[PDB]
């Protein structure tokens, strides 16, 4: 007959005075200690229901999908997206854009040989690039974004960009900076008080500007596509979308609008770049801290693939250890600890509580990923979390870094293909070194809000034999 219980709110400030200084996620984990897995927190002026643990998350996202499949806002980027694009769309717009983005990504490769080939080709470009560096120290963030960006680029814009291209590097810089600012301490505070803080200067202004600058670059590329469009042969997703615009042009309410074009494309480009690159960033940081694991990965590569033939997706079933190491890098690095917010789309009863239409819901994915019933010592990096006694791969229903249900990550198969191919192709050709001894490597994220973002680091890729 009411919302889940939770800390007693003030007017105006919500549960501000009961929050933890270290961030939203910490705040919610202390609430979970007292209230259990289903609780309400007032983030400024509104109630947000928190769902923790795989059972509650799955009960909401899979058994009540008719109710929990709506998308809430992220205060820091809503002023830009405004419900346009597949990530932030709702209702019929999401239905159309979801169907479209999934389907046309497949058209042009996703989950087919074509994208595997694109990934393998891109890994060969990376390797050639790392060879040219001749064991120099770099922060590899730029290359990890470039390779993941070039995969989604080949599908969306019909092309890849060269690693040396400054205009490309500029977009990458903007995705990196924006993800950090969104995840910053200011970005968390903005989630609570955006109604008041938007009137003043701050990072929300910088994120909107960055986004608009990415939007412009995407505008120019859309114009180029418009000029050269061949209706009998679309080259990529922009062309296919442009064809949908025309087919539907007599309907003033068509979802295939120009704002959806720019913002859906931006959504895909952003998500297709920054999620996988950040994961890899933690992977190599993790490798540096646990060189024994890197070594054991390389032994497997030697034995299953050898030193020269390039890794392919068919290699996965025969490399349980590397696959365990990648699962554990995903579990540990916990990209979106609170997922992306949802919002129930009708009155729903959940475990005896009534959750009104339009209440926001955070599914704390992190609580599934750190569940001590599924992972012993969930705070430590340990690939044994994903292996049985025999050394065979052990998958678990608690492994939900892409979430579940109707809004489940639509790039899951791509991201898994990229993580395996890029991780193994790099390790087959190179070992890693850095100036910081493994004992002294700090894994503490540089930001932790919407995104968990690893700290910067230097690394060397040393060629084998
Ligand atoms: C390690 C890599 C990735 C992780 C951990 C990840 C994680 C997630 C999560 C947790 C969600 C939210 C699902 C929900 O709201 O319940 C999401 C949504 C989404 N992701 Fe991924 N993602 C990754 C890679 C990708 C890639 C490579 C792409 C694009 C090719 C992509 C595109 C999207 C899109 C478009 C959505 C919104 C889906 C919708 O709202 O219907 N992601 N992702
Ligand atoms: O009094 C104390 C309370 O006892 C103390 O426990 C509480 O501190 C918490 C306020 C800070 C929480 C704010 C965070 C919320 C969003 C994420 C970052 C900031 O407020 C006052 C701080 O001195
Ligand atoms: C709107 C609503 O009418 C209004 O009720 C709401 O008030 C915001 C009050 C809280 C602001 C206080 C925060 C200021 C910065 C430090 C954290 C606390 O935001 C807007 C203007 O107040
Ligand atoms: C799916 C997402 C990946 C990264 C950040 C959070 C969303 C974004 C706002 C595009």
UniProtKB/Swiss-Prot annotation:
Phosphorylation is accompanied by a decrease in enzyme activity. It is an enzyme of class 1 (oxidoreductase). It is found in: Endoplasmic reticulum membrane; Microsome membrane. Its EC number is 1.14.13.-. Its main location: endoplasmic reticulum. Its cofactor is heme. The modification Phosphoserine is found at residue 101. One of its GO terms (molecular function) is heme binding. GO terms for biological process: epoxygenase P450 pathway; ketone metabolic process; steroid metabolic process; xenobiotic catabolic process; xenobiotic metabolic process. Changing residue 145 to H: In allele CYP2B6*6, allele CYP2B6*7, allele CYP2B6*9 and allele CYP2B6*13. Keywords: Endoplasmic reticulum, Heme, Iron, Lipid metabolism, Membrane, Metal-binding, Microsome, Monooxygenase, NADP, Oxidoreductase, Phosphoprotein. CDD domains: CYP2B (cd20672). Belongs to the cytochrome P450 family. This is Cytochrome P450 2B6. It comes from Homo sapiens. The gene is CYP2B6.
């Amino acid at each position: 007959g009411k919302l889940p219980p939770g800390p007693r709110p003030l007017p105006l400030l919500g549960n501000l005075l009961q929050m933890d200084r270290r961030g939203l996620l910490k705040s919610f984990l202390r609430f979970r200690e007292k209230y259990g897995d289903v609780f309400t927190v007032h983030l400024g002026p509104r109630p947000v229901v928190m769902l923790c643990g795989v059972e509650a998350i799955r009960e909401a996202l899979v058994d009540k999908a008719e109710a929990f499949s709506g998308r809430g806002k992220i205060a820091m980027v809503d002023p830009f997206f405004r419900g346009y694009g597949v990530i932030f769309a709702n209702g019929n717009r999401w239905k159309v854009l979801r169907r479209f983005s999934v389907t046309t990504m497949r058209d042009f490769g996703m989950g087919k040989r074509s994208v595997e080939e694109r990934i393998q080709e891109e890994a060969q470009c990376l390797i050639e690039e790392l060879r040219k560096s001749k064991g120099a120290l770099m922060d590899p963030t730029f290359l990890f974004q470039s390779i993941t960006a070039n995969i989604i680029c080949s599908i969306v814009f019909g092309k890849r960009f060269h690693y040396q291209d400054q205009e490309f590097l500029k977009m990458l810089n903007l995705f990196y900076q924006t993800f950090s600012l969104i995840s910053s301490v200011f970005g968390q505070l903005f989630e609570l008080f955006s109604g008041f803080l938007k009137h003043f200067p701050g990072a929300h202004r910088q994120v909107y500007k960055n986004l608009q600058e990415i939007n412009a670059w995407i505008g120019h590329s859309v114009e180029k596509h418009r000029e050269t469009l061949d209706p009998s042969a679309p080259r990529d997703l922009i062309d296919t979308y442009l064809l949908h615009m025309e087919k539907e042009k007599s309907n003033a309410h068509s979802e295939f609008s120009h704002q959806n074009l720019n913002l859906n494309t931006l959504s895909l480009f952003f998500a297709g770049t920054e999620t996988t690159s950040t994961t890899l960033r933690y992977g190599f940081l993790l490798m540096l801290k646990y060189p024994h694991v890197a070594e054991r990965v390389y032994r497997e590569i030697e034995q299953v693939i050898g030193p020269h033939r390039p890794p392919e997706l068919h290699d996965r079933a025969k490399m349980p250890y590397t696959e365990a190491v990648i699962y554990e890098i995903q579990r540990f690095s916990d990209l979106l600890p609170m997922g992306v917010p949802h919002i129930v789309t009708q009155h729903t009863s959940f475990r005896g509580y009534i959750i009104p239409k339009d209440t926001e819901v955070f599914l704390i994915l992190s609580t599934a990923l750190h569940d001590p019933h599924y992972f012993e010592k969930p705070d430590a990096f340990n690939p044994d979390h994903f292996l049985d006694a025999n050394g065979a791969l052990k998958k678990t229903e608690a492994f939900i870094p892409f979430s579940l249900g109707k809004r489940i990550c639509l790039g899951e198969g791509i991201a898994r293909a990229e993580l395996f191919l890029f991780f193994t192709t790099i390790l087959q050709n190179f070992s890693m070194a850095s100036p910081v001894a493994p004992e002294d490597i700090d894994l503490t994220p540089q930001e932790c809000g919407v995104g968990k973002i690893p700290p910067t680091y230097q690394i060397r890729f040393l060629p084998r034999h």
